[PDB]
Amino acid sequence: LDGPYQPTNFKPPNDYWILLNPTNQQVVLEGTNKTDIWVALLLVEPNVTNQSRQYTLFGETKQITVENNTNKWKFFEMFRSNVSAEFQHKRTLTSDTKLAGFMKFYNSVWTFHGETPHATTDYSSTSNLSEVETVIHVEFYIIPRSQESKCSEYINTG
């Protein structure tokens, strides 16, 4: 397993999973190509009553309503496709492992969503994948797409 790597700001290589390993960071990852994709993964701890929380995404202060009725951690995948748009809550990963994933592949950004141990991948399309850069606020590992079955096993079982 390649890593752990320290939090960083870099352009992740195509066709590799970034496996994200937070402790208590509220913003786990911010990725954008500054044109048609913004992705932020927010971490919401177990047993959080419906409330507004403040997050700094891409240098902008945002108020985002969160809730987590479960004993699992939730990664909220916040998305927009235009610099002037509000973020939408696109997907959730509900996790007992506290691991999330991010990959640039096939003109798309890929993430895991759903509830462990049945979390699966889905994508957001981009016209400029090569310019997607990520601020990663957590320890992480790198896994080639060839070994996605191992990435899925980590996401779902730790």
Of 93, 56, 98, 91, nearest to 75 (Cα)? 93
Q: How far apart are CA 99 and CA 22, in angstroms?
A: 7
Q: How far apart are CA 71 and CA 68, in angstroms?
A: 8
| The pair of three-digit structure tokens given for residue 115, joined into one six-digit string | 């509830």
In angstroms, the Cα distances linking 125 to 54, 104, 108 are: 27, 10, 4
Of 24, 62, 17, 30, nearest to 135 (Cα)? 30
Write out the residue range of the structural domain in which residue 150 sits.
1-158
Method used to solve the structure: X-ray
Question: Structural domain tally of the chain?
Answer: 1
With 0-12 CB in 10 A as exposed, 13-18 as middle and 19+ as buried, what is 139? middle
Residue listed under structure tokens 């048609």: 36
Q: CA neighbours within 13 Å on the CB side: how many for 94?
A: 11
Long-range contacts of 77-85 (CB under 8 A, 24+ apart): 77/39, 77/40, 77/41, 77/111, 77/113, 78/38, 78/39, 78/40, 78/41, 78/42, 79/37, 79/38, 79/39, 79/40, 79/124, 80/38, 81/36, 81/37, 81/38, 81/124, 82/36, 83/34, 83/35, 83/38
Q: How far apart are CA 84 and CA 46, in angstroms?
A: 32
Q: Prior bond to 144 cis, omega within 30?
A: no
| The pair of three-digit structure tokens given for residue 73, joined into one six-digit string | 């951690």
φ and ψ of 111, to 5 deg: -140, 165
What pairs with residue 106 in β-bridges? none
